[PDB]
Amino acid sequence: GRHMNEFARKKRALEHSRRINAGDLDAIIDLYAPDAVLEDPVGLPPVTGHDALRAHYEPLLAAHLREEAAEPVAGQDATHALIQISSVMDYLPVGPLYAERGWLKAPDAPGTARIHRTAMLVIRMDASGLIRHLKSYWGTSDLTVLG
Amino acid sequence: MNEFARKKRALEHSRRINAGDLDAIIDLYAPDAVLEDPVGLPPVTGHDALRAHYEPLLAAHLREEAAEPVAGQDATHALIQISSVMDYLPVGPLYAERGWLKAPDAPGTARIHRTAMLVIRMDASGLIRHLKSYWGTSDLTVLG
Numbered sequence: 001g002r003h004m005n006e007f008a009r010k011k012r013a014l015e016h017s018r019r020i021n022a023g024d025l026d027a028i029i030d031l032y033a034p035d036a037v038l039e040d041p042v043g044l045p046p047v048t049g050h051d052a053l054r055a056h057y058e059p060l061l062a063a064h065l066r067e068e069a070a071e072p073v074a075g076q077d078a079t080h081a082l083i084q085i086s087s088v089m090d091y092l093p094v095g096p097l098y099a100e101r102g103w104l105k106a107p108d109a110p111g112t113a114r115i116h117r118t119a120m121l122v123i124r125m126d127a128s129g130l131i132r133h134l135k136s137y138w139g140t141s142d143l144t145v146l147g
Numbered sequence: 148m149n150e151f152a153r154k155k156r157a158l159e160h161s162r163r164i165n166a167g168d169l170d171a172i173i174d175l176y177a178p179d180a181v182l183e184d185p186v187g188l189p190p191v192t193g194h195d196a197l198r199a200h201y202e203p204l205l206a207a208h209l210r211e212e213a214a215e216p217v218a219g220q221d222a223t224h225a226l227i228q229i230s231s232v233m234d235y236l237p238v239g240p241l242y243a244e245r246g247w248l249k250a251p252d253a254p255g256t257a258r259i260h261r262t263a264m265l266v267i268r269m270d271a272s273g274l275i276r277h278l279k280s281y282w283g284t285s286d287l288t289v290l291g
Contacts, residue, residue, distance in 0.1 A: 006283040043220030070228070073264050074283035076187030082264040082281045084214070084228050103220075120217050120226040120264060122281075137226045137266075139150040139218035 002127040006074035009125055013081040016123070016131070017069035023061050029053055033130040040136040041119075044101075059097075063089035063115075079124045079132075087117045091145065103140040116144040148273055150218035156273045157225040157265070161213040167205055173197055177274040184280035185263070207233035207259075223268045223276075231261045235289065247284040251291065258290035 004012075012031070019027045029050055032038075038047040038056060047056045065087060072083035091113035098115075099106050107113035117138055124133035148156075156175070163172045173194065176182075182191040182200065191200045209231055216227040235257035242259070243250040251257040263282035270276050 006285045010285065041220050042224065043222075071262070073262055073281050073286045075281045076185050076283055078187070080186065080281060082226075082266075084264070118215070118217055120228070122226075122266065137217050137219045137224060139220050141150040141154070142217045 003078035004125055004127055004129060006076075008129065009074050009079075009081040009123075010072045012125060012129055012131075013072040013083045013121070013123055014069060016121075016134075017067045017083070017085060020057075020060075020065055020067050023064075025054060025057055025061060028057055031131050032134075033126065033128075033132045036131050037133045038136075039134070041139070042135045042137050043139075059094045060089065063092060063094050065089040079126065081123045081125065083121050083123070085119045085121060085136075087115075087119065088146070089115050089117075091115055095145070098143065103143050104145055107145050112147075114146045116146050118142045148222065148269060148271060152273060153218045153223075153225040153267075153269060154216045156269055156275075157216040157227045157267055158213055160265075160267070160275070161211040161227070161229060164201075164204075164209060164211050167208070169198060169201060169205060172201055175275055177270055177272075177276050180275050181277045182280075183278065185282045186279045203238050204233065207236065207238050209233040223270070225267045225269065227265050227267070229263045229265060229280075231263065232290070233259050233261075235259055239289070242287065248287050248289045251289050253291065256291060260288040260290055262286045 016031055032053055035049050067085050067087045070084040072081045074081050091110045098104050119136045119138035122135040126132050211229050211231045214228040216225050218225050235254045239259055242248050263280050266279040268277040
């Protein structure tokens with residue numbers, strides 16, 4: 001008994017990419033419901049609630065995570081927006097964790113290498129515009145170690 | 148199914164739609180496949196309802212251009228963004244009814260553009276168990 005229209009969900013999905021690029025942690029977290037569930041990537045155990053979300057985004061902000069997002073689409077189901085995201089960030093300090101997980105090799109800078117990743121996000125939003133659930137789909141074949 | 152395999156099947160789905168052969172598309176689906184197109188509408192399920200879903204699209208000469216897909220680290224998912232164009236008839240009038248677009252001044256030369264993102268769940272054989280096609284009224288445009 002209340003919901004968010006396609007355009008607001010769409011803009012909201014673009015705002016998530018926007019705030020990630022702006023690098024302010026407080027703003028990124030504000031987009032999530034207090035108990036929001038993040039799967040990044042889908043296939044690994046979910047990150048849930050604000051404190052865990054902060055700890056998830058901090059290393060990404062340290063690696064200077066940079067996203068260029070394509071135009072999102074919307075579901076006709078009152079909650080969803082999907083968006084494709086191309087991303088670049090430094091190998092450090094996240095890369096070694098992706099290496100340990102089995103997702104990529106290990107460059108030879110590594111403090112000058114960068115990582116490219118392609119992902120498609122499935123985003124569930126409630127009537128307040130808060131993200132209740134975000135699934136970031138990307139595999140090892142969507143993960144590349146650049147220069 | 149490895150990621151590579153999953154990605155290609157996703158691409159193959161767009162290819163067979165473009166080819167226009169009904170049987171070849173349906174052949175990609177598991178016996179109990181579930182299709183949601185669009186997501187938010189009642190699921191289409193079963194061989195016979197899957198055919199009746201794709202038959203008017205084929206008549207509309209639906210063309211898909213697929214972007215590069217991604218795979219989930221979960222052994223089943225591939226996601227793919229799809230831009231599609233089709234003749235306004237015969238499906239347009241359906242969409243216009245529900246208020247998803249405004250009916251054109253032709254309609255015999257008008258086209259329908261659509262942007263969608265698919266979430267495909269496939270079994271070990273590369274058969275589609277579940278396909279969620281996410282597209283909204285704002286992802287739908289009437290051409291000419």
